[PDB]
Amino acid sequence: ALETVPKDLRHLRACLLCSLVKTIDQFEYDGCDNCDAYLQMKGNREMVYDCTSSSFDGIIAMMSPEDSWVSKWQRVSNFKPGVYAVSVTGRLPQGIVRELKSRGVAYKSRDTAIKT
Amino acid sequence: DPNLWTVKCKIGEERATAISLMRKFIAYQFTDTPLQIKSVVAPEHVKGYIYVEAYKQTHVKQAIEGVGNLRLGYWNQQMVPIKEMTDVLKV
């Protein structure tokens, strides 16, 4: 919804798990809207910097994951409508990755770009 | 799957046109005239025109009958080749 819709072009940075592209303002006010329960994106900034990537190539204004071959490719047919990044450059800390694995959420890298 | 249509936009203002059209879609999605298009692609290295993901040129026209930046392409639209979806999103 409009809450997930970014408001300005300043300080855009994409998440590492759902590749959600939103500004620091709504990351502070709400954090993530996809895996907030699994990540605790809200209430801090240092861990937000580690759990979000400022380098993303290409974005998609997907709204219908259930009938999108875009969503098929980028494995967000199960996530909500929103703005997602085609490529995300970064990786979670080993501690957070281990925590997610223990909770049963394997971390799949969103870096789909072809490195040479 | 929906097909891509090439619509001409003011040089250097494709991003602004995309933002404006998505804002208008937000404002008019709950109205009696929602936008039936699925998405819009504005490649970083493509200037002069953008791609609209829709099933019909009628849908494309009804979506682009907003800001005047797309007036030149409003008269007619051009299909994107079937093989060209893979190339559309390459960076």
CB contacts of A68 in chain B (<8 Å) are: 38
Q: A92 and A32 in contact (C-beta within 8 Å)?
A: no
Specify the DSSP class assigned to residue B5.
Answer: E
Contact at CB, B26 and A70, closer than 8 angstroms: no
Q: What residues of chain A lie within 8 A of the CB of B91, using their CB?
A: 57-58, 86-87, 113
Q: Which of B22, B38, B91 sits opposite A58 (nearest CB)?
A: B91
Residue with tokens 């072809």: A114
Q: How far is B5 from chain A (nearest CA, A)?
A: 16
3-state class (DSSP) for residue A35 = coil
A13: three-class secondary structure by DSSP: strand
A30: tokens are 């709400």
Resolution of the solved structure (Å): 3.1
The conformational region for residue A27 under phi > 0 = left, psi -120 to 50 = alpha, else beta, is alpha
Which residue of A64, A86, A113 is in closest CB contact with B38?
A64
- Confirm or reject contact between A113 and chain B (CB < 8 A): yes
DSSP A48-77: HHHHEESEEEEEE----GGG-HHHHHHT-T
Query: Could you write out the three-class secondary structure of A84-100?
Result: EEEEEECCCCHHHHHHH
Domain residue ranges of chain A, discontinuous segments joined by +: 1-104
**CATH classification (class only), A1-104:** alpha beta
Pair of tokens at residue B91: 């960076």
Method: cryo-EM
Q: How many residues does chain B have?
A: 91
Subunit contact A70:B39, Cβ cutoff 8 A: yes
A92: Cβ–Cβ under 8 A, 6 or more apart, which residues? A16, A17, A50, A51, A100, A107
Kindly report the backbone phi and psi dihedral angles of residue B69, in degrees, each rounded to the nearest multiple of 5, phi listed first: -60, -30
Give strand pairing partners of B52. B5, B40
Distance of alpha carbon B75 from alpha carbon B64, whole angstroms: 10
Q: Do A63 and B39 touch (CB under 8 A)?
A: yes
**A46, amino acid identity:** E
> Which chain A residues are within 8 Å of B26, Cβ to Cβ?
2, 5
